[model samples]
Target: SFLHVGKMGFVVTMLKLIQKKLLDKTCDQVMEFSWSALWNITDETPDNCEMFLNFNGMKLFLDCLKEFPEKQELHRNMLGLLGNVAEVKELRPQLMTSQFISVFSNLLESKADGIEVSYNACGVLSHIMFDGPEAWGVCEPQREEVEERMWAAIQSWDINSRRNINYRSFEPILRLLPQGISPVSQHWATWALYNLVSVYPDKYCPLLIKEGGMPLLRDIIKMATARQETKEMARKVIEHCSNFKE
Candidate 1:
């Protein structure tokens, strides 16, 4: 499906065109364009959304945000753009390939980025997780970090031949279980562990046990500090982990 021959040529030309118009916008133009274009990209069809990502629109848009982080209006517009994209649940997978969500995660962590930043990123993250799984969190075409590598490890897992799963990808995620508090963040956290166990149970369940996920998930279920929702997901995850055959 990918044609690299003329891709660079086309990409370079598009970049020049976009760089000029996008960079030429003034503060007023920034607000106007962000609204008009971002809003336009979201509609009954994903054609516009698909177009925006393909034309390298986020580059210029992100550049504007970086250059003017103090502008609350711009931040709101940025959030609005993200929020609009997130509204379409089916496109969540497309976003994984089209954009760097780790940037969104880091943005969510930055108070300087404003409430809209954190809120919308979390919103998008939740949307993606709802439609897919938590293993998608690391954001580099699939957990380019720890979780991804572990998924790769398990892809080759031989359950009947092995006594224990050697991957501990669940460790980083489960390790957060101990800090038990804040439903705002924990629901997503717990939901992730559930996906790890459920979506790829044959692979993830063994990994969880090998990494000692049973105790961590149990702690979450027993932890009085966790919210009811958090405990519920934890219970399910433990249930999956509980039935490990090997």
Candidate 2:
């Protein structure tokens, strides 16, 4: 009760800040705080999810993108906030209605700002796509293309031993490398992959295995490169597909 009472206060405060602070504050501070507010604000529960979006929080976040078109930090934080909300299953429809997946997908590739944009962008898509194709608003043509592209990517996995899949069609997850990604954004990729695997393995794991996901999962566990939650996400997928042969 006490905790939630505080949550109510922060929620109200965040709304006030959204207007005075977010709209008018300096870009770097607003961007960073928005991610913090969304990511850490009020414990990240579904209630807070409703609170954030209800106060037009997502819109404020996205609006920052428009306000500062070339600001790399804005793009990073915008996508990061979306990724934060993407965990709230109840918000999926709102995200699609906002065309979040499409917008972020487009931004993820631009990399005009830096590779971090794509990584953070991928983080949002991973959560949105994590639910599987039907959860998204992708048009039939694009979904069909994804299906085709996914199959081709899987076939390629048969010969190439490289264990990395950056294809959006495979869901917006990644190894963050089995090496290359930035330390911060790297966990974003792995956690997204974890969400994808949480769904039925039959639907997603075949390609995950073929794409060298297991080895990357193994490397995450063995190499000490990523975080513990990342290792756990990897561990579950690895255990789920425990029978996969090398």
TM-score of each: 0.44, 0.52
Could you give candidate 1's per-residue lDDT for residues 79-120 as a string of tens digits?
656655655655556567435565665555544333445544
Which residue pairs collide, candidate 1? Answer: none
Name the runs in model 2 displaced over 4 angstroms.
1-8, 21-31, 42-44, 110-114, 137-141, 144-246
* Candidate 2 lowest-lDDT run of ten: 156-165
Look at candidate 1 and tell me the lDDT of residue 243: 76
TM-score, candidate 1, is 0.44
Q: How accurate is candidate 2 locally (lDDT)?
A: 0.55
What C-alpha lDDT, on a 0 to 100 scale, does residue 64 get in candidate 2?
65
Q: Evaluate model 1: give its lDDT.
A: 0.54
